[PDB]
Design an enzyme around this catalytic site. Sequence first.
Site, PDB file in Angstrom:
ATOM      1  N   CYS A 121       0.862  -1.182   0.000  1.00 27.29           N
ATOM      2  CA  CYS A 121       0.000   0.000   0.000  1.00 27.29           C
ATOM      3  C   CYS A 121       0.902   1.236   0.000  1.00 27.29           C
ATOM      4  O   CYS A 121       1.785   1.361  -0.847  1.00 27.29           O
ATOM      5  CB  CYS A 121      -1.050  -0.117   1.110  1.00 27.29           C
ATOM      6  N   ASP A 170      -8.185  -3.127  -8.080  1.00 23.87           N
ATOM      7  CA  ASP A 170      -7.739  -2.255  -7.008  1.00 23.87           C
ATOM      8  C   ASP A 170      -8.563  -0.962  -7.042  1.00 23.87           C
ATOM      9  O   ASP A 170      -8.493  -0.221  -8.012  1.00 23.87           O
ATOM     10  CB  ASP A 170      -6.258  -1.942  -7.162  1.00 23.87           C
ATOM     11  N   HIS A 202      -7.061  -4.331  -3.653  1.00 23.78           N
ATOM     12  CA  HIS A 202      -5.976  -3.790  -2.855  1.00 23.78           C
ATOM     13  C   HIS A 202      -5.836  -4.595  -1.558  1.00 23.78           C
ATOM     14  O   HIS A 202      -6.831  -4.973  -0.954  1.00 23.78           O
ATOM     15  CB  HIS A 202      -6.356  -2.344  -2.525  1.00 23.78           C
TER      16      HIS A 202
END
Lengths: 234, 234
Positions: A121, A170, A202
């Site tokens: 991330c 994502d 994600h």
Amino acid sequence: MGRELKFKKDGVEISGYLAEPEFTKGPLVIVIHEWWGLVPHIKDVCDRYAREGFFAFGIDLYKGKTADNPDDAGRLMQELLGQRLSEAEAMIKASLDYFKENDIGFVGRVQDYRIGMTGFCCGGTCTWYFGAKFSDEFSALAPYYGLYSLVPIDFSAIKAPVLAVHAGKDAFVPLSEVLKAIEECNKYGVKAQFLIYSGVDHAFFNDTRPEVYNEEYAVDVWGKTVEFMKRHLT
Amino acid sequence: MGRELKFKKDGVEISGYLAEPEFTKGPLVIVIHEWWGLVPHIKDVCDRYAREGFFAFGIDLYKGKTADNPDDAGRLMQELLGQRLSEAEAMIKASLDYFKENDIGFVGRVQDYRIGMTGFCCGGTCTWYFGAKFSDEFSALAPYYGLYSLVPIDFSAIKAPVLAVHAGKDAFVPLSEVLKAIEECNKYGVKAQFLIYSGVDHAFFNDTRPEVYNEEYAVDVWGKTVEFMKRHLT
């Protein structure tokens, strides 16, 4: 073995979790946390690296602060990337200096340091960013689903091979952004391999988050990542 | 030390090269040639698969014809993918039936057949296309740098996991086409992982073509492909 480090070096506070292999004097991997901060999952990843023969340092970039919800997490991340970026750079640099002074990451076979970096991330963004900023220091980069729009990643400066992992669905990183990164790597001759997993969101590697975790691809990507880190760091 | 198979089944003539593993009875991989036809490079790939424990069948889809230049090769490929696509489908199906009749590809651990398919260039296109057409027969698909715009791939029908390999500077397959395939996989729930190697051209795996071969990424992708085929076929 895993130990909590906390010390000062060159005017900055270094803290994080160091996992060490049993006996093996291996390469070092810096592991950068997500926007929640240095939480148990990240320490677990460090332990997993150590079981594969790597020292792994889960560096804290949030000065001991963590978040359990997106609003607080987003504030911590915006502060890190938008106000304290110089400081985080200095923590990375000081950490590297510290490890080298203690012979951590020195690989006997090549008589030299081999240091990788990976993160998830915002830690993926940081992997790219620091990999470009400290391009003489790293021998392998493995950014997972980082945003390219938050900080300027200087693709022209990257010297390490890159394994860039992305999620096909994502919600934070459109595929168009991944395409742009590929074109920059093409342009500057960066040895980046982009791995895009269809149908996952994600943070699919995060086994503590059932809403996004995908076991099949988490197992697959771990295999690929260890192979890549072994290839370039041992 | 492989064998040249030639026989007729269900109205079509089958030919190709079969490499067999020594000392192990394992899965089968069908290997589909590029637009040059069934040339020595492809037989070499079959041999490489056999050294990793797989039966590998390099099927001839060009009825004994090969080409050494793009003009003749392009004509053979357009004929295969246009006029003779039904016939090629029938050759694939008859091959599968032949192997199963002879117990080739039966894996003791799962008490069932495990058959994979891989191919390069036009063979990559074919791997996608036949992987969808014969959805129940294949347990793993590894298409390398095929075009998506030549034949309609029925993404909705694919049931096998897919390792789709692409070149970042492919002169024949724009990255926009790769993105469209990713979106189709997302839409239909295909377990496809897309691996895009920055900086390399179409056919970078082909060690007999020094103008496009890339050793670093050919070694990398071989490792990834064998791991993937072992994961899903053993």
